[PDB]
């Protein structure tokens, strides 16, 4: 069958390096102008923290549980308008996405094995926040990386 619709309940994981404070930015394959932290749908049968862990593993091949890293629950949830040009992946009538925020500090920067994006960059947090098209991604970088 066709790829099932994305769910309008999602997670965001802001990955950064504790040592340099640079933020891991990833180039989307649907909109190559859209660089971002890790995002994805919370699927039926999983919780948001579980979705965050799965997506981090699937997208950037970092196993939070295996590395004994701390997946920080930001305890922030926002709602935003799905970008017009990306709405095609959601069910008919769906225009609003609800996103819950997490952060993940790696001890150092590392080379990244990415699977779903086109490219990655490690950027100073202001540069990262400035680059992303996502307002929520920007705000999460500002509040939980930059401070």
From Swiss-Prot:
Keywords: Folate biosynthesis, Hydrolase, Magnesium, Metal-binding. One of its GO terms (molecular function) is magnesium ion binding. Mg(2+) binds at residues 55, 59, 116. Its EC number is 3.6.1.67. It comes from the Bacteria. Subject to product inhibition by pyrophosphate. Its cofactor is Mg(2+). Binds 1 Mg(2+) ion per subunit. Optimum pH is 8.5-9. InterPro entries: DHNTPase, NUDIX_hydrolase-like_dom_sf, NUDIX_hydrolase_CS, NUDIX_hydrolase_dom, Nudix_hydrolase_domain. It is an enzyme of class 3 (hydrolase). Residues 4-145 form the Nudix hydrolase domain. It catalyses: 7,8-dihydroneopterin 3'-triphosphate + H2O = 7,8-dihydroneopterin 3'-phosphate + diphosphate + H(+). Substrate binds at residues 6, 28, 39, 80-83, 134. A motif (Nudix box) lies at residues 40-61. GO terms for biological process: folic acid biosynthetic process; tetrahydrofolate biosynthetic process. Belongs to the Nudix hydrolase family. Catalyzes the hydrolysis of dihydroneopterin triphosphate to dihydroneopterin monophosphate and pyrophosphate. Required for efficient folate biosynthesis. Can also hydrolyze nucleoside triphosphates with a preference for dATP. This is Dihydroneopterin triphosphate diphosphatase. It comes from Escherichia coli (strain K12). The lineage of its organism: Bacteria, Pseudomonadati, Pseudomonadota, Gammaproteobacteria, Enterobacterales.
């Amino acid at each position: 069958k066709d790829k099932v619709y994305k769910r309008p309940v999602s997670i965001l994981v802001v990955i950064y390096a504790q040592d340099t404070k640079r933020v891991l930015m990833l180039q989307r394959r649907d909109d190559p102008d859209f660089w971002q932290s890790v995002t994805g749908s919370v699927e039926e049968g999983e919780t948001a923290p579980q979705a965050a862990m799965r997506e981090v593993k699937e997208e950037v091949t970092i196993d939070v549980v295996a590395e004994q890293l701390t997946l920080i629950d930001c305890q922030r949830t926002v709602e935003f308008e799905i970008f017009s040009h990306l709405r095609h992946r959601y069910a008919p009538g769906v225009t609003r996405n609800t996103e819950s925020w997490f952060c993940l500090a790696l001890p150092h920067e590392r080379q990244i094995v990415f699977t779903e994006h086109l490219a990655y960059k490690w950027l100073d947090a202001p540069a990262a926040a400035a680059l992303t098209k996502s307002w929520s991604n920007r705000q999460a970088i500002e509040q939980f990386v930059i401070n």
